[PDB]
């Protein structure tokens, strides 16, 4: 289908995988990072049935499957499942076999080297990709947003990274990596919905809660005041339709879950929240850097699409920041989808063609080569 | 750049008028055609239902 | 034949009854359904129509 050896681009998180091709401004398909497996003994004969289901197949057949995520806190722990995801992601929907096209995969700046090494090894030895690159997610977000400078908050399902970049340079001493993420927010919601009389303990139930969160939840500009009314009156409650026709009505839990981003103690996390994490990265940068980072809080990854988050993050930093200074958040509608787009931008830059590891250098050096070549 | 914004308003307002019309007219056409059609279907079914009730009474006498 | 006729007549009645019961529940379905059908789309339409204008500020 393609008339050029454009790189293929994927952003593989602990949640979902966004995929498309280099040179576009959008992914063409999205898959959950899920491989599902039946937990029941077959009784009928001749009904097909796979050993495992991938992506959207895993969710469509989930009624009897246990659903596992191969990626946790930013890294691949199960790469056999990622190979099935990548075949499906690159060839079944995008219709391109990596054998004839370069591939770009992404990681956080401090993501364990073992993960970039496996991403490189898998695409070269299983998919025979002619070339590889593993990209920094923060770089990609800044390209997509039109910035060279800012604090990148990649606040998704796995890990919040929080890295300051200035004039294209990393400022690693100011990175505030935090093990606070969207997967934990979901777990908290499952526990508080349990308190309301709706226990969720199985995979189907877990996926429902993640659906409740995505459709009903928000952070709120002012949590304590929003909670004071939501916890006192039905006027701030919203219902959700459960798959079997039953419904659940949710009050302050609707925003208390997302609030864990600002109050991590809700899940037993030793943290002051994502806005102090952001603030400290600015604080630790040089004094003639700080002004540009205060003016550029960059939103990427999941949770950045909660109602009240763009306004809340600018307000929370303003509250920590010195007066006189202008604090600004970069949070357009195309917010968060900035990391996939950046992968496309980087892969297709003329100034980045020399950064591709070819399947020449790869076999001479082995997968450890990514640590020497990507950045 | 500001021409992008003007183009956005041009398409959105051309769409708005196309929409006010399409939103309303697609419903008035589908909806009035649907009730007119089904007002008749409803009447025809009611007539047939009465006729069958009569037919059943006639068979009961037979 | 008498039993088959009674069963068939009983079934003719039950099946025809089911037919007129369903034609009626269907009419009573569809008719009430078209009300939803004609008003849910017209309300939501006209809401969307109005939105194009509601948003003209």
């Amino acid at each position: 289908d393609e008339d050029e050896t454009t790189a293929l681009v994927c952003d593989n998180g602990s949640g979902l995988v966004k995929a498309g091709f280099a040179g576009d401004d959008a992914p063409r398909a999205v898959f959950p990072s899920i491989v599902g497996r039946p937990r029941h003994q077959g009784v009928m004969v001749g009904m097909g049935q796979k050993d495992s289901y991938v992506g959207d197949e895993a969710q469509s057949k989930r009624g009897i499957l246990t659903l596992k995520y191969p990626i946790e806190h930013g890294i691949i722990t199960n790469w056999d499942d990622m190979e099935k995801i990548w075949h499906h992601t690159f060839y079944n929907e995008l219709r391109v076999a990596p054998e004839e096209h370069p591939t770009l995969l992404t990681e956080a700046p401090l993501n364990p080297k073992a993960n970039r090494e496996k991403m490189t090894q898998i695409m070269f030895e299983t998919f025979n990709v002619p070339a590889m690159y593993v990209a920094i997610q923060a770089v990609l977000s800044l390209y997509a947003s039109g910035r060279t400078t800012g604090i990148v908050l990649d606040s998704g399902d796995g890990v919040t990274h929080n890295v300051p970049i200035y004039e294209g340079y990393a400022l690693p001493h100011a990175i505030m990596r935090l093990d606070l993420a969207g997967r934990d927010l979901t777990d908290y919601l499952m526990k508080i919905l349990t308190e309301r009389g709706y226990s969720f303990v199985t995979t189907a139930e877990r996926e429902i809660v993640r659906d409740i969160k995505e459709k009903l939840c928000y952070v709120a500009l002012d949590f304590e005041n929003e909670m004071a009314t939501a916890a006192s009156s039905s006027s701030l409650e919203k219902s959700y339709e459960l798959p079997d026709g039953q419904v659940i009505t949710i009050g302050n839990e609707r925003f208390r879950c997302p609030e864990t981003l600002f109050q991590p103690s809700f899940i037993g996390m030793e943290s002051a929240g994502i806005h102090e994490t952001t603030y400290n990265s600015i604080m630790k940068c040089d004094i003639d850097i700080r002004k540009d980072l205060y003016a550029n809080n960059v939103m990427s990854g999941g949770t950045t699409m909660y109602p009240g988050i763009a306004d809340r993050m600018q307000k929370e930093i303003t509250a920590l920041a010195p007066s006189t200074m202008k604090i600004k958040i970069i949070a357009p509608p195309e917010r968060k989808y900035s990391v996939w787009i950046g992968g496309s931008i980087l892969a297709s830059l003329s100034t980045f063609q020399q950064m591709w590891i070819t399947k020449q250098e790869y076999d001479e050096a082995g997968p450890s080569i990514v640590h020497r070549k990507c950045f | 750049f500001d021409d992008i914004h003007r183009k956005r308003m041009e398409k959105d307002l051309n769409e708005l008028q196309a929409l006010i019309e399409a939103h309303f007219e697609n419903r008035k056409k589908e909806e009035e055609e649907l009730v007119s059609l089904k007002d008749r279907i409803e009447r025809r079914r009611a007539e047939r239902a009465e006729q069958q009730r009569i037919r059943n009474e006639r068979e009961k006498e037979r | 034949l008498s039993d088959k006729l009674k069963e068939a007549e009983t079934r003719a009645e039950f099946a025809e009854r089911s037919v007129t019961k369903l034609e009626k529940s269907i009419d009573d379905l569809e008719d009430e359904l078209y009300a939803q059908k004609l008003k849910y789309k017209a309300i939501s339409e006209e809401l969307d129509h109005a939105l194009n204008d509601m948003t003209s500020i």
Partner: peptide, 29 residues
């Protein structure tokens, strides 16, 4: 409200930028 989602971004950004300009224009002294 798609019209609003984008008009909202347009006006918040345009007023914030205009306000940032208003504030700087005076603040620069």
């Amino acid at each position: 409200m798609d019209a609003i989602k984008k008009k909202m971004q347009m006006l918040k950004l345009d007023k914030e930028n205009a306000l940032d300009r208003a504030e700087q224009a005076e603040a620069d002294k």
